[PDB]
Amino acid sequence: DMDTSFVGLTGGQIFNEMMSRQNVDTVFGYPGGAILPVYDAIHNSDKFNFVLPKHEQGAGHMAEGYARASGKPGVVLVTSGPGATNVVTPMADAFADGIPMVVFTGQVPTSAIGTDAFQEADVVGISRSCTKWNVMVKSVEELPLRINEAFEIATSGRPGPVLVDLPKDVTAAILRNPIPTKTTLPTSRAQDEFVMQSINKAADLINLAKKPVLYVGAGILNHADGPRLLKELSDRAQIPVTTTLQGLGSFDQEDPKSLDMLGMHGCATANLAVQNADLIIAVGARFDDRVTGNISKFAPEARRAAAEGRGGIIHFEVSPKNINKVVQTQIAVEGDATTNLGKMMSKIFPVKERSEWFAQINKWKKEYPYAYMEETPGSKIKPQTVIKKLSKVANDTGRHVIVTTGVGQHQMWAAQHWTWRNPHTFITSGGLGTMGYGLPAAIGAQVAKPESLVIDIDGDASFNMTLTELSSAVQAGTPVKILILNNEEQGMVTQWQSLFYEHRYSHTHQLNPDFIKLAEAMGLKGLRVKKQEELDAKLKEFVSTKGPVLLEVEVDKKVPVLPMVAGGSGLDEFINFDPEVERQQTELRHKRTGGKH
Amino acid sequence: DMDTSFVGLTGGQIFNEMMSRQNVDTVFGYPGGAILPVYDAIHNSDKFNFVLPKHEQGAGHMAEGYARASGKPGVVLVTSGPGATNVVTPMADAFADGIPMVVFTGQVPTSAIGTDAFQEADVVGISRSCTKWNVMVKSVEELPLRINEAFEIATSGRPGPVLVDLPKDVTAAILRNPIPTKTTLPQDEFVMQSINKAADLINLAKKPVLYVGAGILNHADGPRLLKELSDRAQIPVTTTLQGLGSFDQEDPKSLDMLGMHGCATANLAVQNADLIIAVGARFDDRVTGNISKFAPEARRAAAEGRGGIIHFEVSPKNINKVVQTQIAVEGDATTNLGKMMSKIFPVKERSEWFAQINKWKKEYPYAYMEETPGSKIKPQTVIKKLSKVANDTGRHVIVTTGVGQHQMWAAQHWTWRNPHTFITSGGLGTMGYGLPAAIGAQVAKPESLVIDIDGDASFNMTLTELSSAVQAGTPVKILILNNEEQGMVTQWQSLFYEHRYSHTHQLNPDFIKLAEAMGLKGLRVKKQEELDAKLKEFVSTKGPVLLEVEVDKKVPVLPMVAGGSGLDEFINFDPEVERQQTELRHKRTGGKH
Numbered sequence A: 001d002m003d004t005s006f007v008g009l010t011g012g013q014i015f016n017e018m019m020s021r022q023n024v025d026t027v028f029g030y031p032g033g034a035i036l037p038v039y040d041a042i043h044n045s046d047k048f049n050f051v052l053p054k055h056e057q058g059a060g061h062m063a064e065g066y067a068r069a070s071g072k073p074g075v076v077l078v079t080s081g082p083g084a085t086n087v088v089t090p091m092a093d094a095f096a097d098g099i100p101m102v103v104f105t106g107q108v109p110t111s112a113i114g115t116d117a118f119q120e121a122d123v124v125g126i127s128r129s130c131t132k133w134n135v136m137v138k139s140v141e142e143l144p145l146r147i148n149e150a151f152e153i154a155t156s157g158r159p160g161p162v163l164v165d166l167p168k169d170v171t172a173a174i175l176r177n178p179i180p181t182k183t184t185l186p187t188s189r190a191q192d193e194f195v196m197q198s199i200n201k202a203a204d205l206i207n208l209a210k211k212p213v214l215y216v217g218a219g220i221l222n223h224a225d226g227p228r229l230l231k232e233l234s235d236r237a238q239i240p241v242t243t244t245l246q247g248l249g250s251f252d253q254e255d256p257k258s259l260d261m262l263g264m265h266g267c268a269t270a271n272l273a274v275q276n277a278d279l280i281i282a283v284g285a286r287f288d289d290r291v292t293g294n295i296s297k298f299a300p301e302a303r304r305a306a307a308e309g310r311g312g313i314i315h316f317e318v319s320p321k322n323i324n325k326v327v328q329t330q331i332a333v334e335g336d337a338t339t340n341l342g343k344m345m346s347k348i349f350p351v352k353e354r355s356e357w358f359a360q361i362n363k364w365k366k367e368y369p370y371a372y373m374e375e376t377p378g379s380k381i382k383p384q385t386v387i388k389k390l391s392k393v394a395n396d397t398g399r400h401v402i403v404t405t406g407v408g409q410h411q412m413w414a415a416q417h418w419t420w421r422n423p424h425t426f427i428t429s430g431g432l433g434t435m436g437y438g439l440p441a442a443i444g445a446q447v448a449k450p451e452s453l454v455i456d457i458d459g460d461a462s463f464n465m466t467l468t469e470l471s472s473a474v475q476a477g478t479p480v481k482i483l484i485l486n487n488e489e490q491g492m493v494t495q496w497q498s499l500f501y502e503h504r505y506s507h508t509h510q511l512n513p514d515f516i517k518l519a520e521a522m523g524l525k526g527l528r529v530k531k532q533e534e535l536d537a538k539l540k541e542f543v544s545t546k547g548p549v550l551l552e553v554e555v556d557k558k559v560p561v562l563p564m565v566a567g568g569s570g571l572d573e574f575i576n577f578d579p580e581v582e583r584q585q586t587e588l589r590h591k592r593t594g595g596k597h
Numbered sequence B: 001d002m003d004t005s006f007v008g009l010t011g012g013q014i015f016n017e018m019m020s021r022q023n024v025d026t027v028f029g030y031p032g033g034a035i036l037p038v039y040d041a042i043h044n045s046d047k048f049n050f051v052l053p054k055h056e057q058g059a060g061h062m063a064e065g066y067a068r069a070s071g072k073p074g075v076v077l078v079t080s081g082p083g084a085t086n087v088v089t090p091m092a093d094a095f096a097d098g099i100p101m102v103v104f105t106g107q108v109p110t111s112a113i114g115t116d117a118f119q120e121a122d123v124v125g126i127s128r129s130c131t132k133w134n135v136m137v138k139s140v141e142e143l144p145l146r147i148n149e150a151f152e153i154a155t156s157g158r159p160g161p162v163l164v165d166l167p168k169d170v171t172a173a174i175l176r177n178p179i180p181t182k183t184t185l186p187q188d189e190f191v192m193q194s195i196n197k198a199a200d201l202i203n204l205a206k207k208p209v210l211y212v213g214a215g216i217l218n219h220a221d222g223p224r225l226l227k228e229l230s231d232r233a234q235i236p237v238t239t240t241l242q243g244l245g246s247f248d249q250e251d252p253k254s255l256d257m258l259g260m261h262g263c264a265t266a267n268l269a270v271q272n273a274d275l276i277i278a279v280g281a282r283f284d285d286r287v288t289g290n291i292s293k294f295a296p297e298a299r300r301a302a303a304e305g306r307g308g309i310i311h312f313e314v315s316p317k318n319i320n321k322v323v324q325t326q327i328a329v330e331g332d333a334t335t336n337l338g339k340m341m342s343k344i345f346p347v348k349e350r351s352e353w354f355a356q357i358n359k360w361k362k363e364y365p366y367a368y369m370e371e372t373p374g375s376k377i378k379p380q381t382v383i384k385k386l387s388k389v390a391n392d393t394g395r396h397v398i399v400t401t402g403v404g405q406h407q408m409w410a411a412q413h414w415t416w417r418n419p420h421t422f423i424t425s426g427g428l429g430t431m432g433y434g435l436p437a438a439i440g441a442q443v444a445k446p447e448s449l450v451i452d453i454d455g456d457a458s459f460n461m462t463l464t465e466l467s468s469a470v471q472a473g474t475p476v477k478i479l480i481l482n483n484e485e486q487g488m489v490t491q492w493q494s495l496f497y498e499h500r501y502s503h504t505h506q507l508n509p510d511f512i513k514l515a516e517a518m519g520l521k522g523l524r525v526k527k528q529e530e531l532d533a534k535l536k537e538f539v540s541t542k543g544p545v546l547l548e549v550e551v552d553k554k555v556p557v558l559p560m561v562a563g564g565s566g567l568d569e570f571i572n573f574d575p576e577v578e579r580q581q582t583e584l585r586h587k588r589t590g591g592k593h
């Protein structure tokens, strides 16, 4: 069939029309010359809300935050050259964390491409490795098709970003030819039989397990029923649950079967359970190097069970690229995890109880809590204490709470000390680990959920990366609450410098501006707290302030995040907290640094 | 043959030594996990100074500014993943304007590459199109070699950016075996024939024009030899945006800047010239205008073998890429201009030519709507005043800018006479370049008065680097011409999109309170009567300082050549026309603008 309904419109107007067809209600971008034809077409358009940042990187991170909080793809619209290169980090970031995002970059006229034209860049070539797919629209006739392919690829399989390059002559051009109706409109029986066979094997293996553990990640959150079916399986088979950083919120941590987070900085109990389980059921997780520890030492008991045909590893993965990439698995259940958990449920034998397993796990829970050096008379506020208190204060409001963070120690403490209970409430950069993600992600998340209490638990160095977006929050009308755990250092780096480079802190201390005065200059309320006795009141004021507000908390310095598994250590070969050792290490630091730190 | 001076050292330590060998006195960077082995080796290093920004984009632009003012390559040292991708814009920018830069990016250990490792990115792939050359060091043995190739490449031919990916396990590795000493230490006829033919063609020239660009500035003797040739053969000189400062504009033979927003006189001379002598310029689309209508007289002079276009280009790829030339002199421009000088007859006069040119000079000056009682301050006026106030200081002045109208007005209304004093982003046109570039330049020339003439929107892009200026000890002077808009875009929206300002007005923070928060002095001026006093206080302030000047909004940059217009089909200023447009904008925007 042929469609003539677009004949007569410009590329920009067609773009405008395709947005509402793709159910897009929000667009994040920054205007420019090459992209003018599209902006003129979306001028005053009520098809969607437009959010304007101060920098394109901000638009990209806002879009990611928006996508993480809404489940819908984040749409970015920037110009050619510098406008496009400024979104590479956000794309690389979405690529690592599987975030759906469609990036539209204006380009110079097709007749100028390859002539080193003004503001011309080979964005398709540049974003090749950090997008699931990209393309340069060569004619207005193919604009609808490309847009549709972009949204489909970004939101299917493992979500991810895609880039569509838009030559100025294509968007300014008028469609003078009818186009295929298909290009304008947004399961083998053997395959299904094969998946079902996988599910049956997975079920049989699970019914055999004596010490099972559910290793859950971001994949379970890519379906509305994910958390529900996960809990059902957990309850039904009495299986303890541990999640990755990106899986936090998928399992109710108030549940006794919760093991909390695993990994480099995960709860020792979670790591021990994984190192001792006879069966690891990986659900929507990719065994990244921040989770497995020394891979040759990863899950010894599951490895032993496999050698004896009584266990091993089961993996519910949607992408073939991540199947058997890091570790050999016994059974790979291809496809959407939630969908496959639903099909397998009936084949799982209800389990009365696992007393020994749970008893062992409970001994660990008593022995390895997230211990740290708490406040003492006259001391500075402890960062971990701030998270604990804010978590309670925020939870007690009864509102829907969303948490975004920067990258570093504050990020890990937010992950460890916050009590996660709801899906899609923790938005953080994990794969690429982009400092500066906190503020813009929060702004985007707030646009997605106007009624939610959105908190950006940020670090001082991370915050500096993108602090210019503070005025954007005001202009966007997003009452975000910015929390800066200021230790006047790049904590995560100084930590590694403390542990592996004998306290030699090389250029890891940046000079911060007055955050409170900065906040006021940017248009929002600014609050500071440095005294222990004022923390509670300030957190209260912080959370109940009506518009956007920033709260800086001066926190102790050179405080390591523990437990910790690094180098060639196994998940069960972690460094635990020890007040005596911290005191000795502090003394050693003052000497080695010549009293500078 | 073999060398062992590095044996026993880590890749990081070797890196420290190599910086010394390459005579590097400044490194711009931001630490990270993957690049830790190197940061530990340069800890409290006496080999060079380190400048720390708040964002890697800042580091990149700081290194570009440094390179532009010192003539030395800018060295960047960042971590893997986000650290590397955050430097893509600066590399793309340096690639477009031909700026020497060596970007060192930490990378995850080689045993982790290709596994979607923590903070891993295909940096070599990402930066292929925006670097003259890049590589990933596979072993500490080849580290000295790669570093030497990088600096050599970044500084030869047309200067540009290069990237060297450093795997963590390589920089942490200790060199055990000795390495080749050669890897540890930092046709001619056809050219001569062209030099001779060029000389003759310049002799048969009756209406010659020197079209100079950034190339002339890539050699210490460039400006001097340019003046020599200009005086010797009495030839009027016009420069591109990147050429400003290579020719004294106080000289009667100065045509000023040409192009889209260049001086009308400059464009007319080019369109009527019988011989155009292109020196270190690439005929970009911001200079030529409608290529078909470019240099009509030179094309006719070429058809009659009595003129045309002579091009002094160092890069073969840029010869006959835009327009077909009659004579091409490959190699360094300055060098070839020196070997051609003698073969040039001293023209003692060019009355007819200079007469016509001066005729345009009188009718086509940089005219604009000047201030009137009770009106706002005009941006062009601020540029002219500051230009004078800065000069009266007597010290060396370097100027950086953001991207947009303020950038063009800075180029037109400032009197350029010194080389390497105008640092602006032209090829890629990166907003936010002003501040970090200034900081980089101030580091290169500690004694100079560095001024960043910025726009409000451009400033917002990288304003976080204000605190970096304070930490770096760079007393830069930040000037913000605030019209609360994206000038260049709104201008295009006014001219070509019926005054439909689609998202070109950003909400600005309080620049003065911002400056104070960042740790520097903040000054603001709204009244005409206070402009002069503020400008003086501005430049005479010791440390870093920011001065915001509220200027008239919706003021178009003129003259202008866009679309299918020839350089001679420019739009000139008219006071009555501006009043008409102002009334039309008001009607169309419902009084909003």
Ligand SMILES: Cc1cc2nc3c(=O)[nH]c(=O)nc-3n(C[C@H](O)[C@H](O)[C@H](O)COP(=O)(O)OP(=O)(O)OC[C@H]3O[C@@H](n4cnc5c(N)ncnc54)[C@H](O)[C@@H]3O)c2cc1C
Pocket: A096, A097, A098, A157, A158, A159, A216, A217, A218, A219, A220, A222, A223, A243, A244, A245, A246, A247, A261, A262, A263, A264, A265, A266, A283, A284, A285, A286, A287, A288, A290, A291, A316, A317, A318, A319, A322, A335, A336, A337, A338, A407, A408, A409, A411, A412, A429, A430, A431, A432, A433, A434, A492, B118
């Ligand atoms: C300072 C710092 C410290 C860190 N410390 C830790 C730590 O200690 N512990 C930790 O866990 N992480 C940590 N990380 C984060 C870490 O790098 C990884 O980003 C995170 O572990 C990845 O979790 P994930 O596998 O669950 O999600 P992803 O990386 O998003 O991987 C999801 C996986 O699920 C699959 N999948 C996706 N959608 C579906 C679907 N619908 N159906 C089935 N399968 C699907 C994917 O294709 C993929 O294989 C840290 C990061 C930083 C910046």
Ligand SMILES: Cc1cc2nc3c(=O)[nH]c(=O)nc-3n(C[C@H](O)[C@H](O)[C@H](O)COP(=O)(O)OP(=O)(O)OC[C@H]3O[C@@H](n4cnc5c(N)ncnc54)[C@H](O)[C@@H]3O)c2cc1C
Pocket: A118, B096, B097, B098, B157, B158, B159, B212, B213, B214, B215, B216, B218, B219, B239, B240, B241, B242, B243, B257, B258, B259, B260, B261, B262, B279, B280, B281, B282, B283, B284, B286, B287, B312, B313, B314, B315, B318, B331, B332, B333, B334, B403, B404, B405, B407, B408, B425, B426, B427, B428, B429, B430, B488
């Ligand atoms: C808002 C905006 C408006 C603009 N408006 C204008 C305008 O109106 N007019 C204008 O002129 N520009 C304008 N530009 C800038 C413009 O895009 C180009 O960046 C600039 O014209 C390029 O000048 P250039 O050719 O001299 O330098 P480059 O682009 O750096 O090109 C230099 C050329 O010299 C050659 N060369 C380099 N080194 C040597 C050497 N040692 N020996 C011999 N040859 C060498 C190069 O390889 C190349 O071909 C504008 C930019 C922006 C952001």
Ligand SMILES: COC(=O)c1ccccc1S(=O)(=O)NC(=O)N(C)c1nc(C)nc(OC)n1
Pocket: A032, A033, A034, A036, A080, A107, A108, A109, A112, A117, A118, A119, A168, B260, B285, B488, B489, B492, B563
């Ligand atoms: C990025 O610009 C381009 O896309 C472009 C690139 C090369 C040649 C011709 C053009 S163009 O003639 O078709 N358009 C153009 O120059 N535009 C759209 C533009 N917009 C703005 C806001 N400023 C300037 O120039 C200073 N040019």
Ligand SMILES: COC(=O)c1ccccc1S(=O)(=O)NC(=O)N(C)c1nc(C)nc(OC)n1
Pocket: A264, A289, A492, A493, A494, A496, A567, B032, B033, B034, B036, B080, B107, B108, B109, B112, B117, B118, B119, B168
């Ligand atoms: C950037 O990280 C890497 O380069 C790396 C990447 C993949 C596997 C192993 C490593 S590593 O073990 O060799 N190093 C490492 O993890 N580093 C150097 C590191 N540095 C900092 C500052 N934080 C963290 O982790 C939270 N890791």
Ligand SMILES: Cc1ncc(CNC(C)CS)c(N)n1
Pocket: A030, A031, A032, A033, A056, A079, A082, A083, A086, B403, B404, B428, B429, B430, B431, B432, B457, B461, B486, B488, B489
């Ligand atoms: C970094 C960046 N983003 C966007 C633009 C968009 N263009 C102009 C010239 C106008 S605001 C630019 N020049 N630089």
Ligand SMILES: CCN(C)Cc1cnc(C)nc1N
Pocket: A407, A408, A432, A433, A434, A435, A436, A465, A490, A492, A493, B030, B031, B032, B033, B056, B079, B082, B083, B086
């Ligand atoms: C934990 C990492 N770190 C401080 C290095 C780093 C530098 N720059 C950016 C944008 N992100 C980062 N994660």
Ligand SMILES: CCCOP(=O)(O)OP(=O)(O)O
Pocket: A406, A407, A408, A409, A410, A411, A435, A458, A459, A460, A461, A462, A463, A485, A487, A489, A490, A491, A492, A493
């Ligand atoms: C790992 C990044 C550095 O600094 P930041 O201040 O953002 O965080 P923290 O100091 O909490 O690790």
Ligand SMILES: CCCOP(=O)(O)OP(=O)(O)O
Pocket: B402, B403, B404, B405, B406, B407, B431, B454, B455, B456, B457, B458, B459, B481, B483, B485, B486, B487, B488, B489
């Ligand atoms: C190129 C446009 C953007 O804005 P900016 O505020 O930097 O300046 P101008 O308004 O001078 O164009």
Ligand SMILES: [K+]
Pocket: A253, A260, A415, A416, A417, A418, A419, A420
């Ligand atoms: K928790």
Ligand SMILES: [K+]
Pocket: B249, B256, B411, B412, B413, B414, B415, B416
């Ligand atoms: K001038």
Ligand SMILES: [Mg+2]
Pocket: A459, A460, A461, A485, A486, A487, A488, A489, A490, A491
């Ligand atoms: Mg910090």
Ligand SMILES: [Mg+2]
Pocket: B455, B456, B457, B458, B481, B482, B483, B484, B485, B486, B487
């Ligand atoms: Mg402006």
